[PDB]
Design a protein around this ligand. Structure first.
Ligand SMILES: OC[C@H]1O[C@@](CO)(OC[C@@]2(O[C@H]3O[C@H](CO)[C@@H](O)[C@H](O)[C@H]3O)O[C@H](CO)[C@@H](O)[C@@H]2O)[C@@H](O)[C@@H]1O
Ligand SMILES: OC[C@H]1O[C@@](CO)(OC[C@@]2(O[C@H]3O[C@H](CO)[C@@H](O)[C@H](O)[C@H]3O)O[C@H](CO)[C@@H](O)[C@@H]2O)[C@@H](O)[C@@H]1O
Ligand SMILES: OC[C@H]1O[C@@](CO)(OC[C@@]2(O[C@H]3O[C@H](CO)[C@@H](O)[C@H](O)[C@H]3O)O[C@H](CO)[C@@H](O)[C@@H]2O)[C@@H](O)[C@@H]1O
Lengths: 416, 416, 416
C-alpha cells in the first residue's frame, strides 16, 4: 500500500454505520505493514486517512497509538445546532438544513464513568513508553455530539451543554501535534490534550461545546492560534494548566464560556492580541501562581446576553470578580482595551462598583496603558491587600485604581 | 457518490471552455442526491469540488446555494499581471510565463448593471430563508479577471483597476465561512462578503485588484488574518462596515489601495499587529461612529510611489488627512509605529505640516505610546475642535500634539 | 494529463531509492507538456506533485525552475532525532519508533564546496530571466538530513548541527512563494530563501536544524507567521538581511539557536507578538543599520540549558551583550516582557550586571513600557556612548537605565 486510506473504500466494515470500527481496522493494517522501525533508515512513516464529505456514525472509540497519523476531511461543516434546537419544532421541515455537515463524525458513544470522560471520546490518542507519540494531525473535518441531554437543572435539554462526549482526547505525552481547520460542535468537551509539547491548534472553529480547548496535566512551547471559540457557561473556552511558553494569539473567543482564557499555574506564556467577548465576569483568569505572563493588546468586551433562551443564565460569578483576575507573580498587563456594558439595576452584588482588572495575590505585576470604557463607574484596577509591590501605570485615575499606595507604585492617567 | 468531485472528470460539459457550467452541473447533482434533511441524524453533508492545476475559462456565474460546499485547488498561481502589462510588448515572447497559473479560474463575464456588480461575480453565494448558509470553503485556487479596461481616465487600460468583475461575492447572511490560501488577481473586486458571522479570511494572497476585501452590510465575530493584500487607488485593501468583534491581525498590506483599513460604523473590533504600507495618506480610516476599537502594535509606512507607470497617481487625499483618521468614540490607539516619508516640495496643500493621527470627531479616545519617525516636521496628533475629552500620552512633544488642553488630557513625550 | 502527479505512480524511476530523479523526471514532463505561454489566455499553469506518507530517499538534487509548482505531502512527521541519538543505544530496539515519518524526504546528498551550500540542498529553486519565479508552494511534508557528523569540536557527532545539507534553497528572485505545514529536521540549514518578495512562511515546524529560516540577499513585503522554531548554537532561528516590510509574528521560537531573531540592515519591519526562548544572550539582534522597526508585545525568556548533553554549550556571547541588541536608527521597542534567569556564580564576565535591552549605535530609538523580571540585578536598558538622542520610558528605575541624560530623554518607572 502507499499508506493512503479512504474510509469509504475500506473493505472491512462500513463508515455510515460505524466509522470507529473502520478507522481502527485501518490502524490495524498500518501496524501490520509497518512492523520494523529501522529498515533503510526508516520504518514506520505512518499514514493518512481520508474522510470524504459525508454523515458517518461512530459507535466504537478510535484508539490512535501510532506516530505520524493524519486524519483529514474536506469540510468543517459547522452549522449552529443551538439555534436550530431553539427554533420551534413546527418550522423544522421548512429549514434548508438541520444537521452539521462536511466530513462529519457523529459521536454515538454513551457517557463515561467516574474520572473517565476519556471513555466517551470519539478519538483517543494514548500510548505508553518512549518516545513521545509525535506529529499526529487532525485536519478539516467535523465532530458532532448531536444532542445535549437533561442535567436535572430544569433548562431545555439541548441547552445544558451536557452529554459526556469528547471530540479528541490525547491522554499521553505528545510532541509536535496539530489540530487545524477542524469543526467541533455539540460536545461536552471538544478538545482535551494532556501533556503537550510543541502542540499547535491553528485555525479551528470550535463552538457550541461545553468546553472547547483544555490543555491538561502539563506542557511546553505550544500555541493556540487563529481560532474561533465559543463554549458553555459551566465550561472553559481556552484552558491550560502547568504550561510554559504557551502562545495564545489571534483568536476570536465569543460567548458563552465561563472564562475566555483560564490559566492554572501557567508560567512564561503570552495571551496577546485576541478578541475576547463574554456575557459574564471572569473572562481571563490567571490562577494558582500563574506568573511571568504577558497579557497584551487584547480586546475585551463584557455585556449582557441578548438571546432570550439563555437570558438570566450566568457562570455564578459577581461583578467584583473582575474581567481580568490575576493570582500570581510578575505578570505584564499592557495595552489592553476593556469595554464594560452592564445595567446598573442588575449589578451583583447590589450596588457594587464593577472591577475590570483585579490582583488578588502575588507581587511585581506590571500593569501599563490599559483603556477602560464603561457605561457605569468601574474599578479599573483593584489590588487586594493579598497582592503588593505592583506597578500600575496609565490604567485609570486615582479614583479608578483602588490600591494601597504605600506598597504599590501608581501613576494615574492624566485628566480633564 | 462519495461527494467528491473533480471538474476534469465530470461527463456533462468541459472545464477549459466553461467551468461555470461544470460546477453548476455538479451543484445540481449534489442537490439531486441530497434531497432529505433528516435521515439517520443527517442528510445534506455537502461535498468537495476539486480543481487540478489548469487554465479554466468561466463563462457562466457559479451560484452556490448549499451549505458545506468546499471548492479546493492546488495552487494560488499568482504572478504580477500588472508588471507584465507594463513591460514592453516586444519583450513578451522572451518572458518565461505571461499569465497567472495554479488552479486558475479565468473570469470571462461582462460587467454588471446599475447596482449589480454581483452579476459580474465568478462565484455568487446566495440563499433566502433559514438557517444562514454555513461553512462554505474556498481553498487554494486562483481567480483571474485577466485584463483591466479603459475607464476614460486616459491612463493605460491595464492600469485602471476597472473591469466590473468580482472573484467571490457572498450576498446572503452566512455563518462559519472560510476563504483560505486563495490567489486573487486582476479583478475590480476580489472578495465581497455581505452579512458575515464568524467568517475567517486566513492566509490568502489578494493583489492587483481594485478592491480586495470588502465586508459589507453587517457582521459579527469574524477575522481577517495572515493575508498579503494590495489594492488599487480608487478602492479598498481591507474594508468593513457595521461589524462587531472583527479581528484584523497579522496582515501585510502593501500598496496601492486608497486605504489599508477602512471602517464605517465598526465597533468593538481590533486592528492590531499588521504591517501597513501605502503611497497615499488616509491609510486607516475609522468613520461614521466607529467606536471602542483597538488599533495597536501596527507598523505604518507612508512614502512616495517609486514605480514610474503610476508616478503621480494618488487617491485624491491631502497630507492633512492623516495616516490614522478617527471619527468615533472611545477607541484605543496604542503602541503603533509610524514612518512618514514625503518630499517637502510635493506636500499638498502647499506648505502644510503633515498629520499622522487625526481625531476629527467623537470623545474618550485613548492614544498612548505611539512613535512617529518623519523626514519632515509632522503633527503627530491633531485633535479637531469637533473631537474632545480625549487622553493623549507619549505620542509627541507639546508642539507635535495639536489640541485644545482645556478639554483634552495631554502628556508630552519627554525630550532632549 | 491533468497536471496532478503522485511520486509513487510515476513509471520512470522509483521514489524509495531516489525521489530526486522521480521529481526531476516529473518536472521534465511538465515542461514538455507546457511549452507555449499564450494559448487561449493561458499556457503554463504549472502542476501539483503529491508525496503519500512514506520513507523516500533523495540522491539527486531537485531543481525547480517553473512557476506554480506545488509539492504537497500528508504529514510533517517530526520526531526528535536529537533526543533519540542521546538515548543510550542499547535501549533503541525498545523504542516505538526511531526515525521521523510523514511524507519523508531523506536527504542523501554529500556536503557542498567553497561558497556552495546550495549544492547540498534537496530542493533548489533557481531561474534566470524574467519574470520572477512565482507562487511555488511547499506544503505538509518532511525533510530529514538524518544524521549530524563530526566537526572536530569534540562533541558527540549527532550534536554538532553539522552536515552541509539544506532542506529548501531558493537562489533566484521570487514573488508570492509559500512554505506551509512543513516539517524540517536534522539539517544544517532548513530553509534558505534569497531575494524574496511577498513570501509567506506560515505554520511550519522547523526544529533540530543548525539554522532554520534565513532570508538572504534582500526582500520585500514578506511574512514569517505562526511557526515553531528551534535551531543550533552556531546558527540562526529566524534571520533576515536587507529586507523591508517584513512581518514576524505569532512564532514560538524555542532553543537552541544563537539568536531567536537576527536582522542585518532590515528596515521598516515588525517583530511583534512572538514567544522567544533561548539559553544564551543575544536573542534579538538588529544590526548594521536595522532601522525604523517595531519590536512589540513579545515574550522573552532567557535561562540556563537544563538538558545535560548540551550543558555548558553556548553561543560565545556574554551577559553584557543584551537580550535585545540594537545597532540602528528610529526603532520602536514597546510592550515587551523579559524574563532573565541566570545563576550569579556563572555570569560572564565575572561579576557583571547582565543587560536586557542594549543600544550600541544609532539615534531616535523609542523604548516605552517594557517589563523586566530577573532573579538578579540587571541593566534594563544600556545606552552606549555610540547611541544618542533616544527616548526611554517606563522600562526601569533610574539605576536600571544606564544612559547619559544629557543626550537622551529618560523617564523612570515609578517605585515603592
Ligand atoms: O453568543 C454566542 C454563542 O451563542 C451562539 C448560540 O446562539 O451563537 C449566538 C450568536 O449570536 C449572538 O450574537 C448576535 C450578534 O451580537 C446576536 O444577534 C444574537 O442575539 C446573539 O445570540 O453569536 C454569534 C456571533 O457572536 C452568531 O454567529 C450567533 O448567531 C453560539 O454559537 C455561541 O457560542
Ligand atoms: O506597490 C505594490 C503594488 O505594486 C505592484 C505592482 O507593481 O507591485 C509592486 C511591487 O514593487 C514595489 O516595491 C518594490 C520594493 O519597494 C520596488 O522596487 C518597486 O519599484 C515597487 O513597484 O511591490 C511588491 C512589494 O511591495 C513587489 O513584489 C512588487 O514588485 C502590485 O503588485 C502591488 O499592489
Ligand atoms: O531546548 C529545546 C531544543 O532542545 C530540543 C532537543 O532536546 O528539545 C528539547 C525540549 O525539552 C527542553 O524543554 C523541556 C521543558 O523545559 C525540558 O524538560 C528539557 O530538559 C529541555 O531539553 O524542548 C522542547 C520544548 O521547549 C521539548 O519538546 C523538548 O523535549 C530541540 O528539539 C529543541 O531545539
Amino acid at each position: 500500500s502507499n499508506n493512503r486510506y479512504d474510509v469509504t473504500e475500506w473493505p472491512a466494515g462500513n463508515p455510515a454505520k460505524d466509522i470507529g470500527e473502520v478507522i481502527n481496522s485501518i490502524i490495524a493494517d498500518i501496524k501490520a505493514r509497518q512492523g520494523a522501525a529501522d529498515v533503510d533508515d526508516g520504518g514506520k512513516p505512518g499514514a493518512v486517512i481520508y474522510l470524504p464529505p459525508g454523515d458517518y456514525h461512530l459507535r466504537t472509540q478510535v484508539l490512535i497509538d501510532i506516530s505520524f497519523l493524519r486524519i483529514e476531511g474536506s469540510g468543517h461543516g459547522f452549522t449552529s445546532s443551538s439555534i436550530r434546537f431553539n427554533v420551534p419544532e413546527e418550522e423544522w421541515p421548512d429549514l434548508h438544513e438541520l444537521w452539521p455537515g462536511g466530513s462529519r463524525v457523529i459521536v454515538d458513544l454513551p457517557a463515561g464513568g467516574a474520572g473517565d470522560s476519556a471513555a466517551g471520546a470519539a478519538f483517543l490518542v494514548a500510548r505508553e513508553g518512549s518516545p513521545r507519540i509525535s506529529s499526529v494531525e487532525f485536519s478539516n473535518f467535523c465532530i458532532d455530539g448531536l444532542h445535549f441531554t437533561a442535567d436535572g437543572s430544569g433548562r431545555h435539554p439541548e441547552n445544558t451543554y451536557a452529554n459526556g462526549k469528547t471530540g479528541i482526547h490525547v491522554a499521553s505525552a505528545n510532541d509536535s501535534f496539530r489540530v487545524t481547520d477542524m469543526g467541533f460542535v455539540y460536545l461536552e468537551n471538544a478538545l482535551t490534550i494532556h501533556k503537550a509539547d510543541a502542540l499547535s491548534i491553528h485555525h479551528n472553529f470550535i463552538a457550541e461545546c461545553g468546553s472547547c480547548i483544555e490543555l491538561r496535566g502539563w506542557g511546553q512551547a505550544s500555541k493556540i492560534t487563529d481560532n474561533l471559540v465559543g463554549a458553555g457557561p459551566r465550561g472553559h473556552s481556552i484552558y491550560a494548566e502547568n504550561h510554559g511558553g504557551l502562545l495564545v494569539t489571534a483568536n476570536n473567543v465569543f460567548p458563552r464560556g465561563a472564562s475566555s482564557v483560564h490559566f492554572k499555574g501557567v508560567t512564561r506564556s503570552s495571551v496577546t492580541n485576541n478578541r475576547l467577548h463574554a456575557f459574564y465576569p471572569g473572562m481571563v483568569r490567571l490562577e494558582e501562581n500563574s506568573s511571568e505572563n504577558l497579557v497584551a493588546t487584547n480586546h475585551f468586551l463584557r455585556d449582557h446576553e441578548p438571546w432570550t433562551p439563555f437570558f438570566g443564565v450566568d457562570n455564578g460569578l459577581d461583578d467584583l470578580t473582575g474581567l481580568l483576575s490575576i493570582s500570581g507573580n510578575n505578570n505584564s498587563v499592557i495595552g489592553n482595551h476593556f469595554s464594560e456594558v452592564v445595567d446598573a439595576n442588575e449589578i451583583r452584588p447590589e450596588g457594587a462598583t464593577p472591577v475590570i482588572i483585579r490582583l488578588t495575590a502575588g507581587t511585581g505585576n506590571f500593569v501599563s496603558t490599559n483603556h477602560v470604557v464603561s457605561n457605569v463607574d468601574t474599578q479599573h484596577v483593584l489590588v487586594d491587600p493579598g497582592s503588593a509591590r505592583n506597578t500600575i501605570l496609565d490604567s485609570g485615575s486615582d479614583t479608578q485604581v483602588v490600591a494601597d499606595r504605600a506598597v504599590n507604585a501608581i501613576r494615574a492617567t492624566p485628566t480633564v
